[PDB]
Amino acid sequence: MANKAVNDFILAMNYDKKKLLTHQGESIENRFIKEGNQLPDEFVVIERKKRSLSTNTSDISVTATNDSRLYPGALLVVDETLLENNPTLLAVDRAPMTYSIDLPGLASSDSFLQVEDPSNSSVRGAVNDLLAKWHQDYGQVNNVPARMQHEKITAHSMEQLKVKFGSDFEKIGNSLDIDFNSVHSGEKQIQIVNFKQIYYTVSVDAVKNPGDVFQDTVTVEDLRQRGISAERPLVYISSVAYGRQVYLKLETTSKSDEVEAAFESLIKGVAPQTEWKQILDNTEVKAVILGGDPSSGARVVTGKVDMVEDLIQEGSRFTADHPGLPISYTTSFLRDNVVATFQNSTDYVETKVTAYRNGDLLLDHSGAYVAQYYITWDELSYDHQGKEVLTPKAWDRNGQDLTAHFTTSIPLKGNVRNLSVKIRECTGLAWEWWRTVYEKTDLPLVRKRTISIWGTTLYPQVEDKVEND
């Protein structure tokens, strides 16, 4: 008999489940460069470092909208196309199969769905008609909330993002306009956030015998004609989660330590602190929304930080006006019901940034004496190794005799280090010609420092005024 042979064919298969489901991303040699770059208002120090990301997961994120391959109980072939989340469907004559839907407020009597010929349209139709009946005795009367999961990552490379969010993420990533060259060059920090909102799940019970998914007319010949063997075995979709999904790009020009907490308060809808409000106002937002709204189709929006409140709560309620579309699914090996787990890894270059604000040094001389200034500092940069170089600098008027009223502003960029200022005045006394008015080394590079000198040859005075908000 055909079905017994098919049954025995599947049971006879031995394969390495781990090796079949492992994929290796791009290989980058180990590196570390420390680079300086001067922006208009700040000096940015950039550290690059080769890093690796690896994930082992059974949940497969859905980027498509109306994928007819991704129905509960669908048979998929285990090959490279499955690892790339673009699977080959085995669409042979299917036996009936019993499903269970999991949905708030439902006695396990209407939980089960018997579909005679499993396909996307037939499973779809069976679930949507049960839902239609669920709308009129629970959907509206009882308030039925969606189940929210969210995950985040700092964006560094698209290969990295694919390892985090799934192998077909670029369908999503291309629509977010992610500026990887700006994070690398050090003038942007980007976080990608994914919000899932699960309305309901449709699961398949364990398949007792592998032959139980095929009609009696399906032969070993038919399966081998479609390339099925121990080399390309079968899985079945054992569960599908339905709801709304949001991919959120947060891109800022700030170089702050507080960006994570700033973005986190917004994911949370928390009142922003003063250091974050700077960052949030310099944040751009792009979003891909995968339907919790009629119809099944991707919406790619851009906006302000203020949008994120609305994008998370829009389809947070499943009154089942419109059924959600697939947002993830899990597969299990037909042979033995072992859940298929996918191992993905990649190397990527991590960029971490540190900013140093530019500052001004102001001098006021209102004293009744000749003063001389000796202002020196080092300019920081990095050689092509990433090692520190300190080139010494000096104010062009150092040691010159200056008289009141003298004022000037010396612009000091963020790369200035070891700022030392010494001021002396000519007392006119043969026995004590010069007197030191001010002498400080390693002055903090505040936004604005005003060193004012006044008084007389005998009683000079000084003020060191800082403004650094």
Numbering used by the authors: 1 to 469
Which text from the study accompanies this structure?
The key trigger of this dysregulated host inflammation is pneumolysin (Ply), a pore forming toxin belonging to the family of cholesterol dependent cytolysins (CDC), produced by all SPN strains. In addition to the extensive cellular damage resulting from pore forming activity on host cell membranes, Ply modulates host inflammatory and immune responses. Particularly noteworthy is the presence of a non-hemolytic variant (Ply-NH; encoded by allele 5) in serotype 1 ST306, one of the most successful pneumococcal clonal clusters. Ply-NH differs from wild type hemolytic Ply (Ply-H) by the presence of 4 substitutions (Y150H, T172I, K224R, A265S) and 2 deletions (ΔV270 and ΔK271).
In the present study, we demonstrate that although Ply-NH is able to bind and oligomerize on cholesterol containing membranes, it is unable to form pores. To decipher the molecular reasons behind loss of pore forming ability in Ply-NH, the crystal structure was solved (2.2 Å resolution) and was found to consist of 4 distinct domains, D1-D4. This is the first reported structure of a non-pore forming CDC. Monomers in the Ply-NH crystal were found to be tightly packed and this crystallographic arrangement resembles the monomer-monomer interaction interface that may form during formation of the pre-pore complex. Structural analysis of Ply-NH revealed that the Y150H substitution leads to repulsion between two positively charged residues (H150 and K286), which may destabilize Ply-NH’s pre-pore state, leading to loss of its pore forming ability. The I172 in Ply-NH is well defined in the electron density and is found to be located at the tip of TMH1. On the contrary, I172 in Ply-NH is found to be stabilized through the hydrophobic interactions involving the side chains of F169, L176, Y247, V288 and L290. The interactions from Y247, V288 and L290 might be essential to prevent the disengagement of these α helices joining β3 and β4, to form TMHs for membrane insertion and subsequent pore formation. Though individual mutations showed some gain of activity, the double mutant (Ply-NHH150Y+I172T) regained most of the hemolytic activity. This clearly implicates Y150H and T172I as the major mutations responsible for the loss of pore forming ability of Ply-NH, by preventing disengagement of α helices joining β3 and β4 and subsequent TMH formation. NBD-labelled Ply-NH derivatives: S175C and H184C (TMH1) and D257C and E260C (TMH2), however, failed to do so, confirming that the inability of Ply-NH to form pores is primarily due to the structural rigidity of D3, restricting the conformational change required for the formation of TMHs.
